[PDB]
Specification:
- The structure is cut from a larger assembly and holds one copy of chain A (66 residues), four copies of chain B and three copies of chain C.
- With 66 residues, chain A is mostly helical.
- Chain A has a two-stranded antiparallel sheet with strand order 1-2.
- Chain B starts with a helix and ends with a strand.
- In chain B, strands 13, 15, 19, 20, 24 and 25 form a six-stranded antiparallel beta sheet that branches. In chain B, strands 1, 4, 7, 8 and 12 form a five-stranded antiparallel beta sheet that branches.
- Chain C has 52 residues and is mostly loops.
- Classes of the chains: A mainly alpha (66), B mainly beta (436), C little secondary structure (52).
């Protein structure tokens, strides 16, 4: 029969799941980009900072990873 | 001697409690959590604040998530102590919650009063009253800033914080109606109070700032939230009389898995009046003396636990023609239900029937799905209004099935239902999963 | 982005036109059109556990 | 703004947010077995009235049972202030029996003691509203009262009694109604002419389970961790104006015990756990010429004024040896419940917990009296030298003394709440331990 | 019946009951390590008396310790209404030292502030019962008071201090007793002739562990996430009748702080956080000819009437930048605790949380002041223009003003509750951060 | 399944007369799953004779 | 280090005296099994260490 | 002035010989016993 909710239901779950896959790739990519852009850890002053070079070298607190 | 003598007294009967132990009580390891911070940010109110006016506000995107919302009001007493009753609660006549243009929920001043009557308690309830009324015997002209917390699902738990961060294209708005009159502030019963000030108003939203890893997750992934909604139907009370027990069958146009129903009978003239007036202490203006009038409440003492002044003899809920439970007295719904289901104390005239084991919580614990019930009916039997309200002997020495002659003033009936729906948010937009 | 495509189809339309008020689950009569005139638009309930 | 806090991060924060496990801003709720709850009236077998003993069999009208409320309709035999929790007083005792085995048994005094220790705040007030007249009702007033039962299955759905899993056994509740209830059919020792007999009804809240859960209950064996009340009534060593009485009470208790609780009382006046006095609320007529320290202000029978409590100090011994240092009665009255429950306990009611949280369901330390041969409660009483009719003497006295009227508290009720296991197997059940 | 609800099943039930995960009708209890708890009296060194400092080392009787209660016997030096939480006032402070390191310290005012914010309902009333006289007791009355301590290990079993794992480090408590206690040895500034010196006793509740658990504690390292109280006193920029005072108070705090708390008081009168006035309970003699708005009704020192509070508004700046928008004093007095605690806070006491749920033990967001170079609390005071002796002026006034007597609230107490880590290893321990 | 459509012969060759006990009931309209009617312990047995004509599927 | 049950001493009584034999003659020993699921006793046999 | 009762409970015991002592302790037993069931009721009250 017409089944409005099964037809709309399926359309919704299709978009939703496709969107989830996109979003998951999205968060994975951002995490990978942070690790690549700032592939180091901090030091006692910059305790939880995310760093770009071997030494602190202007590390940040706005791009945390792991 | 000492505690070891107990510890050592161990045997087979202890195995169920301590054998092959799994846990301890003396090593709490706290769960590590994400970084966040919470800021209280003022929203700008659109429209025009004042008695009887409508205003609205759009919640700004200062943070990532929002939870608590507190509406501030400044009111000045239009009379002395005893003339007001939760006036800031009364002033916030209603509030609608809108997400992306869709109405998600709507509360009414009477709901705030009904909700409070059932779910707040002890010092929580008193502190609440301290934020909505004058409780230190303040006098005429006294000025106070009131704080009315909102009770939408996201205003009660961080777990349902609205992800403004995941609503990049949809706005979240609050639409408010301010009462045309507030008792003891700009009106005294039907009389206006000359010189009364218009209220000052401000809406505060508490915002959560998330760290990068969590913000990214929120911004990118879709979400769904299990949320609460309030349904409401207003109707006329089958007014009782000295000559009869009125009865009424109200078909409830309700939907969704409902946690509980709640209702009250009231005199719409006087905010919060759910019971009859009487010449017994606190039951009417001037009660206990010659000047007592059983046509006006002691506003500061509008609520009461004296069930003799309530109008419900008994009630049942019938579903599709079949009784859902046997008919029970009004006192079941007033005292027993909340004993079992909430743990607070409900004032006379306010009733609860839960379908949930624990209706006061967030976690579903049993629901009645009214979207699958063609005919959900609340069946009420009222008490006989034969008691002379001006005579304590009659008011206090009476029986189970009767009430005050002044109980016929409680002509309005407000029936509420709280249910669970799903709010879905994705790719910057959102709305509810179930229409009805 | 793609939000304008699922927002319009997010809400579900669960309707309960002619339901059984009894306690026993009714048998599933497949609503298959056999008559051109006076056709139904009830959309029978497909959510019905027996339980009895 | 909030961001300035968010970035304020250092080593001190690692323990709170490093390697995060949870959030607070996203809650997942659990899906649960579909069920419905209904309050169904039971048939009472026997004549209900004062002094009668009746019972009900809980008809199998659903799958599991939880809450039980006994309804009573009482009338006032006098004015406000003449009754004290009369519906609680009326239900003299309640016995829970499954398949013929006594599981538990409560007494009106237990309900009062339980309440004194474990209910609190508004729940306590509301409870009072369900068992008494608290809005200054007058003589002739009629009201329906609700006395909840407090058996293990009546406190949490988590211990719902699986009637569906008990096909071969009946579940019965026996109720003894008091011969007299103060302010309802008697005033002190005097009958009240014209007093009405109570109306009574028992309501049981049933759970209707979905097919899968109902099948599992019906077919599988079960083990429900439950509580039981042990109780022995006894004589209080009576103190006097000239002496501090002392008493060694053998505690014939068994099973893992969460706590002991006790009170001293005047058996004539329900709920009287303290001495009477001519201070406001402490006796009938207190504050005026007519004050009598032989009759309580019934509506104000309870009090927090320890000066009227009889116990001076106490200790519990296990196998003849001190279990803890002797503490003052006020420790057992105020601190024990502060430490372990979180409410306020009325004077004259005492608690000693063996459990971290005696008020909860989860076992948290018990004293297994089945492994202890000589458990003794050792009590020391205050000197009964204070003239109860004189506020100066009543209110200005010392720690070790009390009212001369404290010698009326000749009854002692000692309770012990313990764990046991209710086993259900193949349609029938009973207690794991004897 | 209930079955009519179960049959009403549809699409909207799937998100609640489809593929169910849990039930409510059967509780799984966890099996726990066997233990027992004993109350043991400590020996206290140094003379006990008003103004004296005494101390005790906790005896190694058990393995872990939790609750600690300080008992004090005080005698009323005047009639009812002359004292205010006198046992709390008496215990001026308590210092916790482990292995020679200061771990924490509480103050009588903190106990009052803490109570004002975090205790509630009957928990609070009973607390009052254990520290004051609340049944209109008269001069000469003697009472034993119990003051529970509020150190991290005194609040939850979860943080029981592992004396067992501290084989080489002692745990000591130092208790400072107040030089004077209102209504006991002094009445305002006047000494009470014949007043008794207090009797003191310190009790510690010991937890005895079974073999397996006891072994783990003695041998393994531990990291206990604990709370600490930071506290300093400040001079108040008191209000004037004609001008509005304001003040920038540097916050000398460090560590991940759950919340700040503060109050404005009259250091003369313990617990006075508000201005006095001729309204019921707001001053000695209020309501009559003798009303004196310079002397409090001590038994009613605390009030909820915000009109007598001094703070107009406040904000916290971090490194010179506003953390949150400026809010009124009533916001910090009523809303903050509404949101974060759920109790009722007395006028004059203010809370600002940096945490989602500061009332619990579980950390839920903190402000780490060790990373904030310049944190400041900015307070704006109400003008003290209202004639305290005239109820019309006291009760009919505006939001921005208070009683002239508010000028006497010269002391400001600012507290911060934070987290730290108490590390225990190889029989020794101390804090991870200083 | 198995239900009321079973006609059993009498236990003796003559005129019969049967009774009906039905002690513990089943008030709910839904037929409860039939229990085993075994004997777990030898102390508290019950003469309940588990009901027949009550099993859905 | 870490004394376990030899600190307070072994319990020479236990729960054997809950149904102790008052007669001078020794009572016969029972195998001490668990015949029924319900009413499982937790009382030790109380056997005389040296017969008269 | 009424006195409180003095009370004592006496039990008469049977002492068995050796063979029966063992048999009773070791063998299972089934004793046919009596029980009293009791319920109180209000009497419909008769009248003149």
């Amino acid at each position: 029969w017409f089944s409005r909710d099964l037809n709309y239901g399926k359309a919704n779950s299709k978009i939703w799941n496709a969107t989830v896959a996109k979003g998951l790739k999205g968060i994975a990519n951002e995490n990978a980009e942070i690790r690549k852009m700032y592939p180091y850890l901090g030091y006692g002053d910059f305790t939880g900072a995310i760093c770009k070079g071997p030494n602190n070298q202007g590390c940040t607190y706005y791009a945390n990873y792991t | 001697a000492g505690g070891l003598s107990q510890l050592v007294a161990y045997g087979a009967q202890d195995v169920y409690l301590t054998g092959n132990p799994q846990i301890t009580f003396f090593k709490t390891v706290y769960r590590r959590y994400t970084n966040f911070a919470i800021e209280s940010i003022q929203q700008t109110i659109n429209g025009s604040v004042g008695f009887g006016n409508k205003v609205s506000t759009q919640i700004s995107r200062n943070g990532d998530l929002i939870t608590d919302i507190v509406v501030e009001f400044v009111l000045t007493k239009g009379g002395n102590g005893g003339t007001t009753y939760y006036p800031a609660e009364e002033l916030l006549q209603d509030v609608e919650l809108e997400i992306g243009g869709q109405r998600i929920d709507k509360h009414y001043n009477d709901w705030f009063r009904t909700y409070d009557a059932l779910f707040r308690m002890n010092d929580d309830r008193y502190n609440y009253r301290r934020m909505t009324d004058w409780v230190n015997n303040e006098l005429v002209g006294a000025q106070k800033r009131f704080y009315v917390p909102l009770i939408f699902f996201f205003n009660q738990t961080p777990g349902l914080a609205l992800p403004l961060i995941a609503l990049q294209y949809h706005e979240v708005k609050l639409y408010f109606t301010l009462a045309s009159q507030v008792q003891g502030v700009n009106y005294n019963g039907s009389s206006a109070i000359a010189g009364a000030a218009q209220p000052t108003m401000s809406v505060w939203v508490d915002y959560i700032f998330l760290d990068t890893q969590e913000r990214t997750r929120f911004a990118q992934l879709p979400h769904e939230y299990l949320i609460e909604q309030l349904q409401f139907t207003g109707s006329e009370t089958a007014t009782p009389s000295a000559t009869t027990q009125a009865s009424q069958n109200i078909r409830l146009n309700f939907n969704h898995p409902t946690k509980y129903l709640a209702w009250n009978f009231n005199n719409p003239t006087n905010y919060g009046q759910y019971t009859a007036l009487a010449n017994i202490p606190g039951a009417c203006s001037g009660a206990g003396t010659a000047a007592a009038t059983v046509t006006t409440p002691d506003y500061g003492n509008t609520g009461t636990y004296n069930e003799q002044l309530a109008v419900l003899d008994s009630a049942k809920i019938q579903l599709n023609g079949q009784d859902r439970f046997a008919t029970r007295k009004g006192s079941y719904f007033n005292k027993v239900q909340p004993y079992q289901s909430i743990g607070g104390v409900t004032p006379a005239g306010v009733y609860l029937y839960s379908f949930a084991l624990k209706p006061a919580g967030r976690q579903p614990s049993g629901t009645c799905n009214f979207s699958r019930i063609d005919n959900a009916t609340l069946s009420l039997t009222y008490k006989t209004c034969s008691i002379d309200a001006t005579s304590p002997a009659a008011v206090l020495g009476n029986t189970e099935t009767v009430t005050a002659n002044t109980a016929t003033l409680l002509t309005a009936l407000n029936i509420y239902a709280k249910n669970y729906n799903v709010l879905r948010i994705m790719s910057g937009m959102g709305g509810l999963a179930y229409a009805n | 982005l793609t939000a304008t495509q699922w927002i319009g189809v997010n809400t579900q339309g669960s309707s309960l036109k002619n339901a059984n008020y009894d306690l026993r689950a009714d048998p599933i009569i497949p609503k298959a059109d056999v008559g051109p005139w006076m056709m139904s638009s009830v959309d029978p309930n497909i959510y019905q556990k027996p339980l009895f």
